[PDB]
Amino acid sequence: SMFLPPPECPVFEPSWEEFADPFAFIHKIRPIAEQTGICKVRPPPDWQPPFACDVDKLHFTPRIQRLNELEAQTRVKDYTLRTFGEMADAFKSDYFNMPVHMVPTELVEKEFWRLVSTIEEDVTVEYGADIASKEFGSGFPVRDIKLSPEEEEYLDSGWNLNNMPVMEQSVLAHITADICGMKLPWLYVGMCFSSFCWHIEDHWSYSINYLHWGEPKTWYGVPGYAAEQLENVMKKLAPELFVSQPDLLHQLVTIMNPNTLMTHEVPVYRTNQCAGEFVITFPRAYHSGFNQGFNFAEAVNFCTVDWLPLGRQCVEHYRLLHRYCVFSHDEMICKMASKADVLDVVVASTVQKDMAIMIEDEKALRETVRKLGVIDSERMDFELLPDDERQCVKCKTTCFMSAISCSCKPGLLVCLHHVKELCSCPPYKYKLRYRYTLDDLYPMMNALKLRAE
Ligand SMILES: O=C(O)CC[C@@H](O)C(=O)O
Ligand SMILES: [Cl-]
Ligand SMILES: [Mn+2]
Ligand SMILES: [Mn+2]
Ligand SMILES: [Zn+2]
Ligand SMILES: [Zn+2]
Fold it and tell me: Contact, 228 vs 284, CB < 8 A?
């Protein structure tokens, strides 16, 4: 009883009919899978996207990783695929003194949790993690070169992870702001023990991960409802990770044994994802894991209509924590409203409900700041400002609906929750900067209603 493996997460094997629409399928399994945080999806047996690449022309800059439980790592920050693969196979082979396909997955798991907890061991490994570029592209077929019929079959698949974030049931689709770190797929070259620390996705989005080829990836996941339980356990064991961070490039994360969570009554599930299988993580579902050997995976974030209310809650949670946003949720909502006529109807219906809450909150906030003595106001096109020029001084939220400025501190803004935090001038010197009047906003919401019918 060194390591007691968590119970297995749900595994789905959709029929071709079920599989034909990824968003319908994800909606269908949600009641089950949101209880476990992660789930595994095996596509129909003949869904087999062709993979092809020259192992000598693909190069990438590896990240180095120390394997110590509870030690701080930063979430985001030269080999060819062949030379990495050679290093990776030799590492595993020498570590166990065995051929690679002979090392049992149970053993690699048990040994991982041993080595990260033992101070005397100092194993370091390497891995790749980068968004698709011309130097290293998607593992799925994309359009340009002369493609074979096989590749053409998979070009428009919903499960082709390049398409997932442009589909009609997707919400993150119409965002015009630059969120490239979030809407483009990431490519991951793994090796034995290379690991991803406990985290949730930005803005509590979904993620979906496809293992193109190689040895399995071992996952642990925690359902969304238990996120704060996990954070409380982790805060007690590693408070350093929870100090305020200067930006998004300084997110601190760590390796932590799932048995520790289970001891503290945090529900945790596991799975081994093999080549050709999907793993899906649900909103605010903590997950971590490690690779069993040399492999190649591809993952992307996405947001469904189910996620919309959670996205709003997330930004509220970021504000309470003074965490930076990747994008403005309200700006996304208003962009969609301005495109109501071309929106999918269920999407239009869900956006309308979120917009109604947005407007009612904004109404109350503006009444409050008026009572504080802010009188002067001027329209402002917040979406034109670079993000770093429209973050609240206090809580760092990305402003869009409104903010307060003072001629006293040129360029500085606070959101309407932090009117007292801008400067020492009396509020009558302040200006309310707003994107829309309430009277602009109600017709926008009405367009959505008409589209939703
Ligand atoms: O985070 C990683 O490094 C692996 C990707 C995983 O977190 C995912 O959400 O697909
Ligand atoms: Cl160690
Ligand atoms: Mn993730
Ligand atoms: Mn505060
Ligand atoms: Zn603020
Ligand atoms: Zn001032």
Answer: no
